[PDB]
């Protein structure tokens with residue numbers, strides 16, 4: 001349990017996934033800072049927080065004597081990451097904000113909070129510090145999208161349709177290794193659906209709209 005060979009194998013993929021995720025979050029928020037001049041300094045602050053998270057999780061892996069399987073993690077994020085990239089190239093800020101500040105942050109919040117109670121004491125302290133920042137990142141995107149809801153609504157719907165299923169696939173792909181780390185799938189699914197559904201309601205979506213938007217992920 002922590003030093004077991006089964007735990008260490010699963011941690012190799014999970015730890016690689018969180019590190020790769022933080023690294024991409026870093027790049028994502030820097031690109032967003034390019035696209036949103038009025039919030040350029042705030043977004044740069046979010047990016048610097050991501051760099052800290054990445055470093056903290058690299059340390060978690062070293063503490064369990066685990067080599068992160070980065071190749072597995074690259075492939076894990078590829079589709080969703082390339083979608084961000086493409087949206088960024090076409091100037092689609094709304095899509096980029098949805099992917100990184102809503103969908104990805106909600107996923108991280110739900111998984112990290114599930115990991116905390118079963119995490120070794122060193123990783124538990126790191127993750128507690130990390131999840132504190134994730135609330136702020138999600139709050140940034142919700143606040144912006146809520147303030148710009150009418151202009152953003154049509155693109156949000158389209159972005160959700162294309163990208164929510166990718167994250168569900170990512171949630172499903174990670175479920176086995178997560179269980180080995182003592183994180184139950186059913187907790188992950190419920191918590192992610194609740195957080196993302198609640199964030200959509202806060203932004204301004206109706207119930208039928210939230211059910212429609214959620215169902216694109218769940219049917220995948």
Ligand SMILES: CCCCCCCCCCCCCCCCO
Pocket residue numbers: 014015017018021022025050057060104105107108111112115123127174178
């Ligand atoms: C060592 C941490 C354990 C939790 C593992 C969670 C399993 C997969 C979810 C990964 C989500 C990473 C997203 C990071 C984005 C940060 O803004």
Ligand SMILES: [Fe+2]
Pocket residue numbers: 022025049050053130134
């Ligand atoms: Fe982060």
Ligand SMILES: [Fe+2]
Pocket residue numbers: 025050105133134137
């Ligand atoms: Fe984040």
